[PDB]
């Protein structure tokens, strides 16, 4: 339970054209650290920044301090999943769901994502991306069920930002204790890649904290 | 070519839950009037309200004046698809996409269909909506290409609305002339149903024009 | 009674990105026919280093003409009179507040507007005054909670061509209890007839139509 | 030469709803600690019928802990000063626009402030008055076509449990060339710590520090 293994699909479609993911990773869920490598099976060589797919391949894996209740911990062995709409500033929306489930060690998701309008001229469709920018996800809970939104943005290449709004629904698979309102900071980082990003080595870091003391 | 078919499938997910809805039908295309019988195929009973579907089971089926131009028919027999996305007021967010190609005097639809951040006490998974209003979208070109946004709203069971903001990308397979600023007219209906909404009887009706004059 | 011809009195004070400025306005306008026209002069804050269009959907529903069949919510809220408020959110996110508190002065209708419009980029069409003119719009009418709403999404053509998209969300709110309708459409279509060249003074017309959709 | 104590005076004149009020402050705080606290009295429009919360965040980022290693936009600006410009997007549709003007006066600094609010529900917590506090909160500040901007979504505590979320957006314009920065986030505390009963008097506090994100 230290240290833990992933392994996930992906399969999903932007702007109408369908592709397919695999990952295998591991990560340190007390430490709040994870990575992973992916490869593209299906819809390659991808025609669009790979940075929109990053934050959506778990927060188990973050790290949380004890005065504040850990959710996502707490919803093993049985599990929970997420449901998430990203809204980025030129009207590009992605929706992803991710279905997290445990086995023995290792955590396997069951990924679906979904973008549209991406617009040609974008710096999506455009791969002018150039990594996301750490955040700060405020996390509460809304009719008895846990929420997570975050208001971020990908660096772009002639410099400047391109801004997303992320909204995320957390749902356990059984009743867990639900935490009081907090944050959980983030950063993600894609370490290296082939050419047209066929393989990927991505890691994530965060810490959940209660805000400016 | 007056009167034609119509055959689709539609594959998609709700929170997370996945289904596939197949429709046959036949329309109109120069007085602007469908109908269609899909019949639920995975994923029954639908856990969800059928209206969130019904705008997403084709703009060739609108009455177009002489005074506009026509993208819609004009894009044929190669055919088009469209991008879209629904941003309800609560915050749940349906993205569809949908490939229209014709064989030899049948329409047929490739449908995804990916909705998310539904709340479970809200009006879609509770189903209590009861129609969709009729509508006026507007259609203008951004970059080259054709873009359609139309704000409408559900009637609720016990009075009142539920509001939505769609947005539309539309690409012909071709280079068709663009049409200059304009309006659609939309009335969706659910004729007929059975209790769960396995098998439902779907019309539609719409005119171009060019606002008041 | 609302007659076939009534007057309209204005002002308007507001800021754009922070600049203070005052209009004042007099015009006439049939219910009936669903039309109306005003004359607009700039008395603070002049020239006005905005684009002017984005005052004028600002600048009275009861100038709508409503069928016998649907409820008239503006001609029913008289002699008391109505308010409003609206909030327009442009989509490079410049985003103007406004209010009108309407009253009724013998065969008068006086407005006190407010308007606040702030995060207009110095680059975009507003600053840089490259708008041309509204779009025939399709307002949509319907009852939250006992209060009639309005929403319109629209757009403003542009000089080099394209459109600038605006979304409004309106509350109106009569000052006595009167019988609200069902879900309808208002379209509209507002234009700038003549003006001097910094806008000093401005001649506007709008023409409404109430409906109930595709039948 | 910002110095470790400085000064706040400042008048806001504003509506919500449609009705207007005034109030003005005075204060104190320290820029070098990224602490601040004021003592705000009601002019005109009390009692103020809506929840006080929606005012507090307007009434200045030069009393932020900014460390050597950030750029710091607000206090280059000075003596000459800086202005913002801000929307408050409510989840229930209430929407406030703000602007404010800093100058500074020998050790204090004066802010010229405008508020328009418009749309809030009367059953919602605004109008209801069932607000507690706001959250700390996390500010994003990037640079957009040469310009400042600071992003931040965030929400006010209810009285029954639950929040109701906000976003703001704010540009930041000084009065003179100024370097700028990169991407940085200031994390915001903000407290109402004591109050008459109908909210003529406040007295408020905040505490800001600029940092770099999760290292």
Chains 1, 2 share one sequence.
Not at 17 to 31: D, N, Q, R, S, T
Not at 33 to 55: C, N, R, W
Request: proline letters at 6%; hydrophobic letters at 30%.
């Amino acid at each position: 339970k230290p240290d833990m293994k992933i392994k996930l699909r992906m399969e999903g479609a932007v702007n109408g054209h369908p592709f397919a993911i695999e990952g295998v990773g591991l990560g340190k869920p007390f430490e709040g650290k994870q990575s992973m490598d992916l490869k593209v099976k299906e819809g390659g060589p991808l025609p669009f920044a790979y940075d929109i797919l990053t934050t959506v391949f778990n927060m188990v894996f973050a790290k949380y301090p004890e005065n504040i209740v850990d959710y996502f911990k707490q919803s093993f062995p049985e599990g929970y999943s997420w449901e998430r709409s990203m809204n980025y500033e030129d009207g590009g929306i992605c929706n992803a769901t991710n279905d997290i489930t445990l086995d023995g060690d290792c955590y396997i998701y069951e990924i679906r994502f979904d973008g549209v309008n991406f617009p040609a001229n974008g710096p999506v469709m455009q791969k002018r991306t150039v990594k996301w920018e750490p955040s700060t996800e405020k996390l509460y809970v809304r009719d008895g069920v846990l929420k997570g939104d975050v208001n971020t943005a990908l660096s772009l290449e002639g410099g400047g930002h391109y801004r997303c709004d992320f909204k995320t629904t957390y749902k356990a698979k059984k009743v867990v204790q639900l935490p009081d309102y907090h944050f959980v900071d983030h950063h993600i980082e894609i370490k290296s890649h082939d050419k047209d990003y066929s393989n990927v080595n991505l890691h994530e870091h965060a810490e959940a904290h209660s805000g400016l003391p």
